[PDB]
Amino acid sequence: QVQLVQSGAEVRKPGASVKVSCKASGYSFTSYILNWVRQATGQGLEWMGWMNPDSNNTEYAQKFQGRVTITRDTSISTVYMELSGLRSEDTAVYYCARHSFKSNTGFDYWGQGTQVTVSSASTKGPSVFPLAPGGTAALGCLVKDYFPEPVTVSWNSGALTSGVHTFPAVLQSSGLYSLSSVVTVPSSSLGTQTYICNVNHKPSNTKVDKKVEPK
Amino acid sequence: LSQPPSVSVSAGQTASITCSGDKLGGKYGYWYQQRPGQSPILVIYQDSKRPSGIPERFSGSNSGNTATLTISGTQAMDEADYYCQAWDISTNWVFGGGTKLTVLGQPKAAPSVTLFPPSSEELQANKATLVCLISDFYPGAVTVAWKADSSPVKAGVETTTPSKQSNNKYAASSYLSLTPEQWKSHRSYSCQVTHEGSTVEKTVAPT
Amino acid sequence: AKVTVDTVCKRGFLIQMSGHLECKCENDLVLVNEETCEEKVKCDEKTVNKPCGDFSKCCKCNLGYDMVNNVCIPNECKQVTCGNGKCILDTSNPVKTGVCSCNIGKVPNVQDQNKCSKDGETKCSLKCLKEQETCKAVDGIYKCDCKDGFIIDQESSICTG
């Protein structure tokens, strides 16, 4: 199938540069133009530029004063969006989407999104603690004190999808994020079924696996 | 492009989201649906066409200076942000300001409060936090109150504003950060959650 | 004259590009004028002043056109090349001058002497009123073809499934 996969989330200091990638598969790379859209937490989608891999021609938005640089790599079917002179305005989620002026399809397929945070602090790994446990029971994970967002939590290597509910994080006075991901499961499975908590924090390259079991 | 910021529709009725432009009748109209946290999806392309998998309840029109998105029989799974798009010669791609579609008439739901005590592992890390997990409620407005023994707690609390779940309901978290000394010194701790007038409360003890 | 959306191409159909419309002749027919098609005939003695090509009589092109590269193009488009498009006659200006009309997906580029080197959108204005037909981009031009999922039945020349 056709898929647009981007890089992981990153944290940058004010003034540094950020380079986000976008991988293309399942279609002729040179056929469609790959755009770049960002979106602050508050505001809506904002187009910044595109790259036509058939012509190696780029078009940028006037409001991005020479700071957006989109470079391609048809060998890996990957386009790169580099943003320089980072400020607080650039803290947003960045998307890549393809479109065809020959087929008039619009942004039919989007990327997964890459959350870029611009802060004077550096990345920090999380500390994961077990949240020990109709006829159901609740158990989960406490992803504690990490920076920055996001942290993705799966269960049983992604084989357990029904009942999982990763909650939005909270920011404490120290400036670190903490969240909890909880899953509801039949009480009979306790003791019979083992539940593994897969925490992933790409900004600090840490993957934590917690086994939640009754006390 | 100009869109109304908020549009409310009764459940089962028809919702209309307009998009006004300079010469929008001469451009192709594209509509995108974006639910909180995930990427937008194309729901209407080329003014009136819909991609595969989009229900037949989504319709589109584009003529003159207005392009309208119409959803017949709006359901709970339609509460999201709908964006407008058209390609202009000077400024290439232009997105609309957005539209938060609110589907009224959804049945009231009672929260499911699950209070967790500080883990033994984190107690060995010399920091103790209680986790109150509120979920499966509607409307998405709650009030949380923490109590040490029988007295209310004000500090050390961090409550998150509710947000949509995977089940089209709202969920929120509240964290009470204490020291291990404060945790073991009290007989119990309670998480009191008020939804509408009905109050639900869960209690845990250090023992 | 003015080939518009309402023009009925006799023995032919309408096509659209970046900045104009045209009539394309069905099967192996040729254009006697802008809006009618007739069977084209190498030319012999019996076939004098018959259509030997698009806008050509007997094989010299008609008045206003010149045989350039085995086809007949308007005289004002003699030396103009667009690349991802074709040269047409500027309708607005009185002295009709050769301007570029691009394939679907391209537009005249202001930084390239209005050549077809800029990616742009072109909205189809064709009214395909026939049975189960819509405007689709086929081989770089807009035309009326069967709708999504329909195939022309040769027994009736209609789009069915």
Residue numbers in the entry:
A (entry chain A): 1 to 133, 140 to 221
B (entry chain B): 2 to 208
C (entry chain G): 1 to 41, 43 to 59, 71 to 173
How does the study describe this entry?
2587 was identified as a Site 2-directed human Fab due to its strong competition with 1260. However, the crystal structure supports its categorization as a bridging antibody, also helping to explain its partial competition with Site 1-directed 1276. 2586 has an epitope on Pfs25 nearly identical to 2587, despite a slightly different competition profile. Interestingly, seven Fabs (2523, 2533, 2578, 2585, 2586, 2595, and 2596) competed with known antibodies from both Sites 1 and 2, suggesting that these sites may not be completely disparate but linked in one large immunogenic face, here termed the “bridging” epitope.
We determine the co-crystal structures of four human antibodies bound to Pfs25, and describe three novel protective epitopes on Pfs25, including the most potent mAb yet described from any organism.
